[PDB]
Structure formats: structure tokens, C-alpha cells
Amino acid sequence: PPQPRKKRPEDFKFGKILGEGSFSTVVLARELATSREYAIKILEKRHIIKENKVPYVTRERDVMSRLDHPFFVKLYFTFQDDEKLYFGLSYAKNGELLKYIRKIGSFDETCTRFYTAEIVSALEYLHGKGIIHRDLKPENILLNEDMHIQITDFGTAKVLSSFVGTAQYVSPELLTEKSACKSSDLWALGCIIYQLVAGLPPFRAGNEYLIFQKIIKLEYDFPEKFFPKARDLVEKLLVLDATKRLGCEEMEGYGPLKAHPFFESVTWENLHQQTPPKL
Numbered sequence: 001p002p003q004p005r006k007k008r009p010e011d012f013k014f015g016k017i018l019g020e021g022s023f024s025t026v027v028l029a030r031e032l033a034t035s036r037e038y039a040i041k042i043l044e045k046r047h048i049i050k051e052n053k054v055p056y057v058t059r060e061r062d063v064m065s066r067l068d069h070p071f072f073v074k075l076y077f078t079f080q081d082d083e084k085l086y087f088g089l090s091y092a093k094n095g096e097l098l099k100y101i102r103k104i105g106s107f108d109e110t111c112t113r114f115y116t117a118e119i120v121s122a123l124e125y126l127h128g129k130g131i132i133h134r135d136l137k138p139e140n141i142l143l144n145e146d147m148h149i150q151i152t153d154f155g156t157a158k159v160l161s162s163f164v165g166t167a168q169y170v171s172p173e174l175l176t177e178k179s180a181c182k183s184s185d186l187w188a189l190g191c192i193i194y195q196l197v198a199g200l201p202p203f204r205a206g207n208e209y210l211i212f213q214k215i216i217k218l219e220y221d222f223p224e225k226f227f228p229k230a231r232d233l234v235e236k237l238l239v240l241d242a243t244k245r246l247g248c249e250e251m252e253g254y255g256p257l258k259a260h261p262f263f264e265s266v267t268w269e270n271l272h273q274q275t276p277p278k279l
């Protein structure tokens with residue numbers, strides 16, 4: 001199938017930096033022939049080789065190519081010059097969800113229900129494909145123009161036939177066995193639901209080590225205000241035994257999770273078509 005010609009850096013007007021990865025920087029760019037705004041992730045070939053991240057960058061590019069859902073960032077193109085790799089990603093104008101958490105303080109029952117449902121729906125799609133995010137957080141959950149979610153950051157991701165993510169969202173099994181699966185994402189989800197309601201992640205401490213100490217002993221608690229049905233859901237996600245997490249294969253998958261009382265009024269079938277509640 002004759003696809004288009006390769007794009008090149010001179011086809012774009014590079015603009016502001018949108019972010020920084022571990023071996024990359026994401027730049028807002030405008031395609032001149034179209035006026036289209038893309039978030040171009042730029043990677044330096046020498047640095048990637050030097051740091052032994054060729055399998056990292058490869059996996060990332062391969063995962064993003066495999067994604068085809070409105071709740072995930074899309075990879076439109078890739079090209080390369082003599083020094084750099086460029087990945088043309090969808091641009092989420094309204095930025096990260098973490099900025100909203102900080103701005104509005106903490107979400108009401110409607111917004112929490114809506115944005116959690118989208119995260120559940122996205123994870124259901126991702127996990128049905130045998131992909132695992134391994135680093136999910138509000139920083140990774142972007143918001144497009146129409147205020148729907150767009151998950152990004154697949155560098156750290158794994159495809160089902162090693163690494164430890166952001167300390168606050170790390171699951172216990174990761175801390176002990178040095179292992180992960182779909183259950184690691186569901187733990188992270190539990191942390192997110194908590195942060196949406198409370199305004200803060202559940203396990204917080206002076207340093208990485210103390211955070212990790214709280215995680216393994218399940219040393220967290222709910223504020224007085226916390227919605228009971230969201231409190232219940234979080235309690236069925238922040239479970240130490242990975243096999244007892246609501247939403248995993250042993251717990252009979254996404255059916256029982258999408259069925260939790262917290263999501264009674266949710267119509268799962270067409271979330272992308274729904275108008276997001278005002279924050």
C-alpha cells in the first residue's frame with residue numbers, strides 16, 4: 001500500500017517545549033502544508049545508543065503504532081535526520097490531568113466518576129491488547145481540546161509474550177518480586193481514583209524509601225469527605241495480593257469492575273461521545 005512520503009524537520013515550524021522524558025524532549029510543532037499541531041517527541045540517537053535505550057525506544061514506537069483508541073495518544077509519523085529521531089504524536093491542548101487536580105483542588109463525584117470511567121475504558125482497551133502501561137499517572141493522562149483523556153508515555157510499557165515507575169504509583173509486587181502485569185495498572189488506577197477525590201496520592205512520605213515502606217504495609221487512610229462508593233472501589237484496587245484486585249483475570253476481568261456500584265449511572269459503550277462534566 002503506497003503510504004505518503006517521509007516527513008522531515010523543514011516541513012514543521014517548531015515551537016514551545018511541551019515536556020521532557022528520560023532520553024527525550026516533546027516539542028509543539030505546526031505542519032506547514034496543513035496547519036496541524038503535533039507534539040513531536042525528539043530523541044537523540046547518540047544518547048539512546050550510549051545509555052542502551054534502543055530496546056526502550058523500539059518497544060515505545062511499536063506499542064504506539066498498535067494503539068487505535070480515542071483515549072490514547074496517536075503516533076501519526078516518525079522520521080529521522082542524522083542526529084535525531086522524531087515521533088509525531090497527537091497534541092493534547094488542555095495538558096495533563098495533574099494540572100487540573102492542582103487547579104480545581106479535588107474533583108466532585110460526577111467528574112471523578114467520568115474521568116475514572118474513561119481511565120477504566122482505556123485500560124480495558126490496552127489490556128485487551130496485551131499491553132501494560134507500567135508507569136501510569138496523572139502526568140501521563142492528558143486532556144484533549146474537548147476535555148476527553150489521551151493517555152501517553154509508552155516508553156516504560158510492556159507487551160505480553162524489569163523496570164520500576166513513579167514511586168507514588170508503584171504496586172507492592174513490583175517492590176518485592178521485581179515483577180508486573182495488568183494488576184500493576186489497576187493498582188495505579190486505585191491511586192488515581194484516590195487523588196481525584198482527595199486532591200493528593202494515597203501514599204506520601206519524605207523520600208522514595210519511606211513511600212515504598214508505606215506501600216508494602218498498605219499504610220494509607222481515607223479523609224472524612226471521601227465518597228463511600230469511590231472509597232469502596234479504591235479498597236478493591238489497593239489490595240496487596242495482586243490476584244485479588246477488582247478488574248484482573250483471576251477476579252474475572254473488566255466486567256465486575258465496570259459493574260462496581262460507583263459506576264451505576266455510567267454508559268460504558270460510548271464515553272468518547274459523552275460531553276465531559278465541567279471542572
Ligand SMILES: CCCCc1cc(-c2c[nH]c3ncccc23)nc(N)n1
Nearest residue numbers: 018019020026039090091092152153
Ligand atoms: C514524563 C513526561 C511526559 C512528556 C511527554 C509528553 C507527551 C505528549 C504527547 N502529546 C502531548 N500534548 C501535550 C502535552 C504533552 C504531550 N508524550 C510523551 N511521550 N511524553
